[PDB]
Amino acid sequence: YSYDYEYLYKIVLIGDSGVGKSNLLSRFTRDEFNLEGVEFATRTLEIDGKRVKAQIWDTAGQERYRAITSAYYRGAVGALIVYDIAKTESYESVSRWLKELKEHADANIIIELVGNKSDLDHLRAVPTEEAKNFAMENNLLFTEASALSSDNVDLSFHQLLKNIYEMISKHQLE
Amino acid sequence: YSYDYEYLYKIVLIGDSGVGKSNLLSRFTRDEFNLEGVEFATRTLEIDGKRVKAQIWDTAGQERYRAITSAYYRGAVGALIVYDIAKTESYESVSRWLKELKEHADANIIIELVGNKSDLDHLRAVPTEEAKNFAMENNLLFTEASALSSDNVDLSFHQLLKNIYEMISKHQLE
Ligand SMILES: Nc1nc2c(ncn2[C@@H]2O[C@H](COP(=O)(O)OP(=O)(O)O)[C@@H](O)[C@H]2O)c(=O)[nH]1
Ligand SMILES: Nc1nc2c(ncn2[C@@H]2O[C@H](COP(=O)(O)OP(=O)(O)O)[C@@H](O)[C@H]2O)c(=O)[nH]1
Ligand SMILES: [Zn+2]
Ligand SMILES: [Zn+2]
Ligand SMILES: [Zn+2]
Ligand SMILES: [Zn+2]
After folding, report:
1. Helix-strand-coil split of chain B, %, nearest 5
2. Which chain A residues touch B6 with a CB distance below 8 Å?
């Protein structure tokens, strides 16, 4: 048998404007997607037998013109860095978002690199192997996804929460 | 170092009308007490290094005339059975509340017996040793408390949440 309790994880979504952060959230939490306020959404799912309440934060679009404030990252245990596989610029900015996390987020936050818009294969600018190699180099989890076609969307969120739970537990047997 | 995450525990308060359930809640969550809606309150505190968000439920007084519905107990990991040390009847009803928990609450809910109104020592009807012996007999945690004078109030809630966390963890090394 198992006891009746929940884990509270705060996750933040970061990345350049237009990479599909808000559509990743609406696809995972409400299964909706829009071709071009709601501060965060919560979905609860089972991770290795345990119930995990994931509170996933999303921007209001201010990252297009200014830097995200420190309060956005506070309390977050995981983070998704989203880029556009069809936009090189959005992939080059991954280092900037890594700087943002080191500067305002928890020192041991668990990071996952997400390559969104995998449906635009005719416009692919960033090869999967380049970003996958970069993720392992910087000890980030990695997947490509498509909020439009729902490919690997649940995988991007389940992979991070599963790694958070296991990395926490593994850290607990000190 | 420790990761940034929380545990969500639902706790319910049960006992006969007038034993001091609502005043136990206001004393622990808001440090207020009244001499003779708000469905539940949440207070977060540190249990053995970890952060535990306790959601403590309280009745609207319907237990005076009818039985508490099943939905009140659903999801609860712990429960406080409160009686009046100055009212024998309220102590005799502890078996009824144990029946209520077996009937509508989780099969492995952790129960604590609380003897409230310890300040009315001139009116003591239930000796501490009788209820303490009864609690160990039925594998309940036990303390006396006074919502009026704040004695053992934080102890009654901290003792239960600490036992819940450790009993869960101890159950986890299957
Ligand atoms: N083709 C495609 N377009 C997407 C995808 N995800 C988002 N978009 C589009 O990208 C634009 C910006 O998306 P949005 O979620 O607002 O990006 P955000 O600024 O990071 O939140 C929208 O017009 C979406 O239609 C995807 O997986 N595939
Ligand atoms: N002397 C004393 N009176 C108390 C204590 N706790 C509650 N009361 C009184 O008992 C009455 C009923 O308390 P209440 O919290 O509403 O009981 P409930 O029905 O179980 O919620 C109130 O008038 C309180 O003033 C206590 O620790 N000591
Ligand atoms: Zn957005
Ligand atoms: Zn910054
Ligand atoms: Zn009450
Ligand atoms: Zn019943």
Report:
1. 35, 25, 35
2. 7-8
Q: Name the resolution in angstroms.
A: 2.3
Contacts of B106 in chain A (CB under 8 A): 3-4
Q: Which of A8, A166, A169 to mutate to test the interface with B (most CBs of B within 10 A)?
A: A8
| Cα–Cα distance for residue pair B155/B133, rounded to 1 Å | 19
Q: Which residues surround ligand 4, an ion (CB under 5 A)?
A: A 67, 100, 103
* Residue carrying the six token digits 């921007």: A59
Identify the CA nearest to A140 among candidates A67, A91, A73, A174: A91
**Any idea which residue has 């999801």 for tokens?**
B75
Distance (Å, whole) CA B124 – CA B173: 43
CB-neighbour burial class of residue A170 (10 A; exposed 0-12, middle 13-18, buried 19+):
exposed
Tokens 């239930």 correspond to what residue?
Answer: B126
CA distance A80 to A14: 6
Q: How far apart are CA B59 and CA B81, in angstroms?
A: 13
List the domains of chain B with CATH numbers.
6-174 (3.40.50.300)
Out of B3, B53, B75, whose CB is closest to A4?
Answer: B75
Experiment used for this model = X-ray
Residue A42 CA to residue A25 CA, distance in Å, equals: 10
For the CA of B17, the nearest atom of ligand 2: 19
Sort A140 into a burial class: Cβ within 10 Å, 0-12 / 13-18 / 19+: buried
**Residue B73 to residues A10, B9, B160, Cα–Cα distance (Å):** 27, 12, 16
Paired tokens of A44 = 């609860």
> A107 is written with which tokens?
């020192």
Distances (CA, A) of A85 to A82, A101, A144, A149, B50: 9, 21, 8, 15, 39
d(CA B54, CA B8): 6
A20 lines ligand 1 (CB under 6 A): yes
